[PDB]
Every structure is written in C-alpha cells, then in structure tokens.
Design a protein around this ligand. Structure first.
Ligand code: IWE
Ligand code: ZN
Length: 258
C-alpha cells in the first residue's frame, strides 16, 4: 500500500508515512505574482548545459526520468539565489489528464498542463544522497508547459515513451540536449521548499521560470499514454502525477524581474 496519486494513496495520505508532508517548507506553492517581491540583489542565473551527457530514460512508476552523467561538472546551474555549483542529475515532468491541470506550482491559482523539473545537487556535499539531507542541497529549475505549438526539442523524448510504457522499463537515451527545453527568458521566481514527492525532504531551492514553453496537444497526449503499472498488470494511465499547492507559511517568494 505504497504512496502514489490514486484515490486511496494520493497526496492527502502521504503524511501518514511522511509526517514532514505538513512541514514548514513544503512544495509546491501558489505563486501570487502581486505578493512576490523583486529582489534586485539576485545575481543573474547561469544555465550551462552545452556539455550535458544524457544516459537513460526510466519509467519509475509515477513519472519518467531522463538521467545524466553527473560524475563531473558538465551540466551545471549557478547564480540567481544559489551559492556555489549545482550539477544536473535528471529531469522529469508532472502532467494532467486534461490541459487545464498538471502543473505543481500555480501562478495566481492558474494551473498549467504540465511542469518540467530539472533537478540539480550542490557539489559541496559530494553526492546526491548527502545533498538531500541539507537545507541547500538541491536546486530545481521548474518550467511550465502550455498546449499550443510543438516544442521541437521535446520530440526525441515523446518518441521514446512507447519503449518505457510501464513501471521499471528503461531505454538508452544518449546525446539529448536539455537546452532545447528552455524558454527564451530566464526571468524567475525563487523560494525555499521541498521535494514534491515522498520523502518530501526540505532540501530544495526552487527556481520557477516565468515564461512557459509551448508543447503540442499530440506531445502531451503521448505523456498520457504511459502507465503507472508494471508490465502484465491492469492498465492505469500515468496522468495527474502532481501534488497540489501547499501552505506558504513563513516564506517569501522573490522575483528576479520588475
Ligand atoms: N518533483 S521534485 O521535487 O523535483 C523531485 C522529484 C524526484 C523524483 N521523484 N521521483 N523520482 N525522482 C527527485 N529525484 C532525484 C533523483 C532521481 C534518481 C536519482 S536522484 C528529486 C526531486 Cl527534487
Ligand atoms: Zn518533480
């Protein structure tokens, strides 16, 4: 009876196994655009992905992860609110059953169709497992998806999903360039938060881009054909794998822009 996003094991249940679910810095949150303050002291954000080495794509039974070689400083996030160097380890998405829901963060209570999370760990802690035990251990770059024009840089991901339909399936996924998933502007909001999946550790600096990327209806429809189940089990479509907005509590959301 493990956590998930079903009727009986969804986000409202997670506190029973993970009491930090009701903690002081849980994610995601609603970004109230009128309450977020411009912080002119935020340094410019540095996304250095030209040397990124993608390795593999995995269906982990609640999303799919694109994993990178993070055994050296190739693909790194620096600047903005961050002290030091954060190495890209994986990206994944959250999405909906319908275009009107799917994102984890919301903007003035608006839900986007999906949300991309590029997960990075703080290299001063030496490995990801040590970093998630620290209040500044991770940095996640969050990017909203809206449905409209296709995102050409997403299609290589869409086209491999047929090969990882069910939980525990993986496929080689080399030479994927995550720069193709970025919007034009790097304007962002930032706040201290958590993992949005169990174990919900309070170890994340969130950096959420203001500009959404556009993907096509056909692209998001292919996300919704994945399965939560393993092979040879009753089909349960992988949709609505998002945690809703959590209380902001004693936190301020800072804007990089006026
Ligand atoms: N939604 S999120 O707050 O961005 C988050 C979600 C996951 C996730 N959910 N399920 N599987 N991974 C994650 N895993 C990191 C790694 C995966 C494998 C080796 S390290 C990290 C973060 Cl910060
Ligand atoms: Zn995520």
């Amino acid at each position: 009876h493990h956590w998930g996003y079903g009727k009986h094991n969804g986000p409202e249940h997670w506190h029973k196994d993970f009491p930090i679910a009701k903690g002081e810095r849980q994610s995601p949150v609603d970004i109230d655009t009128h309450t977020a303050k411009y912080d002119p002291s935020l340094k410019p954000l540095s996304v250095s992905y030209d040397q990124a080495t993608s390795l593999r794509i995995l269906n982990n039974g609640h999303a799919f992860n694109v994993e990178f070689d993070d055994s050296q400083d190739k693909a790194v996030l620096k600047g903005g609110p961050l002290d030091g160097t954060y190495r890209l380890i994986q990206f994944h998405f959250h999405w909906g059953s319908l275009d009107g829901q799917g994102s984890e963060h919301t903007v003035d209570k608006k839900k986007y169709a999906a949300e991309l999370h590029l997960v990075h760990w703080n290299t001063k802690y030496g490995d990801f497992g040590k970093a998630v035990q620290q209040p500044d251990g991770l940095a996640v770059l969050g990017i909203f998806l809206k449905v409209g024009s296709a995102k050409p840089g997403l299609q290589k991901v869409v086209d491999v999903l047929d090969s990882i339909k069910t939980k525990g399936k993986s496929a080689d996924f080399t030479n994927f360039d995550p720069r193709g998933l970025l919007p034009e502007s790097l304007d962002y909001w930032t706040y201290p938060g958590s993992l949005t999946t169990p174990p919900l550790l309070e170890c994340v600096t969130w950096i959420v881009l203001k500009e959404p990327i556009s993907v096509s209806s056909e692209q998001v429809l292919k996300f919704r054909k994945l399965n939560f189940n393993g092979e040879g089990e009753p089909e349960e479509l992988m949709v609505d794998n998002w945690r809703p907005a959590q209380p902001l509590k004693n936190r301020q959301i800072k804007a990089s822009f006026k």
